[model samples]
Target: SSQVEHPAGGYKKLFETVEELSSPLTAHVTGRIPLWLTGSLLRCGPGLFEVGSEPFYHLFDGQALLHKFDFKEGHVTYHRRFIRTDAYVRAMTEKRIVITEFGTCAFPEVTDNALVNIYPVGEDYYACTETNFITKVNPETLETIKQVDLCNYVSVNGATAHPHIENDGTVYNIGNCFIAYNIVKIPPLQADKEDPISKSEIVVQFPCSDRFKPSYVHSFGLTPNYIVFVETPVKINLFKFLSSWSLWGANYMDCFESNETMGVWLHIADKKRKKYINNKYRTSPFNLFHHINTYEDHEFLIVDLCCWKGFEFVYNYLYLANLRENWEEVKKNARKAPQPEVRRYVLPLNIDKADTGKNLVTLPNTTATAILCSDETIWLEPEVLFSGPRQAFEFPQINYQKYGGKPYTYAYGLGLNHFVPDRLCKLNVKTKETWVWQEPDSYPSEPIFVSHPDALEEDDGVVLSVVVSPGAGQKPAYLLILNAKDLSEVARAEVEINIPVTFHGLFKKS
Candidate 1:
């Protein structure tokens, strides 16, 4: 066995035991809490890193722990609790790891714990992971209400956790059906408050040429009249997954591999017609975990996304033990690794008028695949809007009310520092300017943007993030609030105990 000590700083608390909060605890304030920031910022991610004495293999292996910071009338309240998932309960009861996760393996019967994002199903919210089901959580108490099996209503292998919400409260998500991918849409909660998925609608069921090469899409694009699926080369091999499951109990994502020669295929669907567009466009190969925003202008559809060179980010997400063992090497490679580029792809709906010379652009180190679409086709190359300093920027967010399915200005996301995220950035494409707030030795989770109730400006609001500081001997975390306009510090509410790193969150007004 390797004998490397867990490195100091942010990663030191990666495997620390988190004590569940019995009730809501009042956070000690450091500055004046804003009166306008009255809402509940709820975030969820893996919290229980270990069972008994043994730790899980990957960060995603930890069970879902929901953390909420409620801001109202200059006072803040902090609360946290495990989602009480069956996998979590079983492992705790058995006093050992007995579940399957995206990057870790255990007992096959155990389900994937919902640990990623929180979505509102009308007045209620559901904790979700990139799995086949979503666990409803009581917004007030942060308790797991029940698990809703999406398969029960929609017959698909799995669905994405990052569902796009329309202005009218329609929830759109992607699902990996055996031979095709399904774009599922669920309407707002009915009057009876019955099965949400039963009222689910399919916008398009895109059939694939190769059943085994379905791209591993965590998120996609949504516009007024189009639903965009940017299929990358990162694909899942079913045979390898089945074999790995039987032989070593591997998790689902472990079965995916990066196919070098394949180009990114864009599948555009017309929402009005409820069918995919006639011609598919192809561009340089790239992997994307999230689509920042999308909109249509005349004949072109714009897709802004966090672009990666390949699926190499997984190496940085191995077990804590492995991470520690090669801490120096990992940190070195992290700086040298190709950072995520915030790129804008201009896809032309009218192919005949598109310029072929300016359209097809080759990627940095790979050969460009031959154009596969129309003869008059033009595959428009992507423009890098912003690429931060050697940090992998992810978990992008925007003012949905003003920007969803429309061309917009500002966007916010986390800039990775070492392993955990440490910076909150506000990027303005219109102004060609970027503002960032970063503190030494403090790891911040995904920033949740909340617009002011009476705000006139697009970004006239506050950004909320949970900052975890791995103290030399103890871990201390706090809820940080920043001015959205300038990325300046507004205030911070220090929690009584350390909170685990969370993936995504939602801000709900009182």
Candidate 2:
């Protein structure tokens, strides 16, 4: 309720709505774009914050904007389009919001737009945002082709934004069933007639911790052999979700609840057996969003996550009202985002021979430990892989095409200095060393790794990111290419139009 003191303010433009270009514009290249790196990068995030005087209250409530950057023959072309979602269409048609978003309770006949992430379903791509609907999009034209509902095929209410797509195009994701959670699987599209999702099946299903409440799940971890699901303590109260939501116009965040004493529960399911290990795994309470990488090493399964600790309601700080507050007011820690850490936890694949109360992890050098407790549950202590000084290392990605589920050295991430993606980072997981790329007053999106065609090394590739500045004259945004090995700037394709920093995306090789 206090102030907007200065004439100059950063991070204000990032929240503003941006224009979409259906027609692609050629970007001005400064250095050479790798000829071998010809592909289309598809990005999705919040584009429109307000409609007809009703403002979206949270960062998660924005309407979907799908952006694309095509690279071919040493040239980059930029274009973007808004997903023609029911919520978007109806909101604009009605001159007000007609659906419920994460932090906004509009007059909802609810459906959140596909604004968060994009994924490939065999040859076709789709945009999704943790709801029942996913829009099939034209990767080349950057246009919405059609929409599909998960309820028609699967028994879940909604799906996560991120899905673990295998090398062969099989998509695996976690979905919330009003009463439970499901591991949903969609088979790859073949030369058949029916859609791939029609053939989708629930790989596994588990009941909620409480009969009336369910824990929040953003993403899950997958490897060649296993699926790791972290059921954090953060939960949603059905009483509030059903009662207060209809009576008081309560937002999605209002229904959220958490108990730090309950701790975070870990469940590991084997792909071959399609069953979880009978052992119970629990760790100290913390919130989470992205899974870095999961792999098998000797006698244990290693799981990595961008972890948040000591805070339950991390979404409260993400309210747009708080973000638009004066920078000085924000830096004072009144509602700062809890620092996220890159944590590695080791799961003993076979604990039959391990004694209770003894550390079971036999790995060398890593501080990660696993102890069998008296309650028959294993207590996990994580190894601090990477952390920043009051900065967050989230939105993690790696050389996924080649080294996704296996042990790898390099991982790329976006560095957030108080919610603004101010830089990009390359971290060596084994050595715990980091290399960063930062510039004055410029924020970059999540770095997408595109491996070299013939390179054998894990880090022998270039990283791609879309960088946006708060204020500038002619050139306002650009596509940044950097050496994956050293995080060094290789090239930049500058554009005249202003752009906002975005979330997760993938580089599809054409």
| Candidate number of the best TM-score | 2
Clashing pairs in 2: none
Over the stretch 110-149, how does candidate 1's per-residue lDDT look in tens digits? 3659888898766668898878878999988998889888
> What would the TM-score be for candidate 1 when compared with the true structure?
0.91
lDDT by residue for model 2 (1-510), tens: 011232345667678888788599999999899999888989988889999699999989999999989999999999998898988888889999888888988864447598889998867899999888999998888878888888989898889998999988899999888777899998987888557887899887665667887888999989998888888888988889768565787877898988757788888888767776666888888889999999989878889899887546778778888777776776665335566788999999878644888988889968999998888899999999987655778889999988888998888898876665678888899999988898766778899998899999999999999988666553778999999989888899998787765777788888
Go through the candidates in order and give the clash count of each.
Answer: 0, 0
* Model 2: lDDT of residue 198: 79
Model 2 RMSD in angstroms: 3.0
RMSD per prediction, one decimal?
4.6, 3.0
TM-score of each: 0.91, 0.96
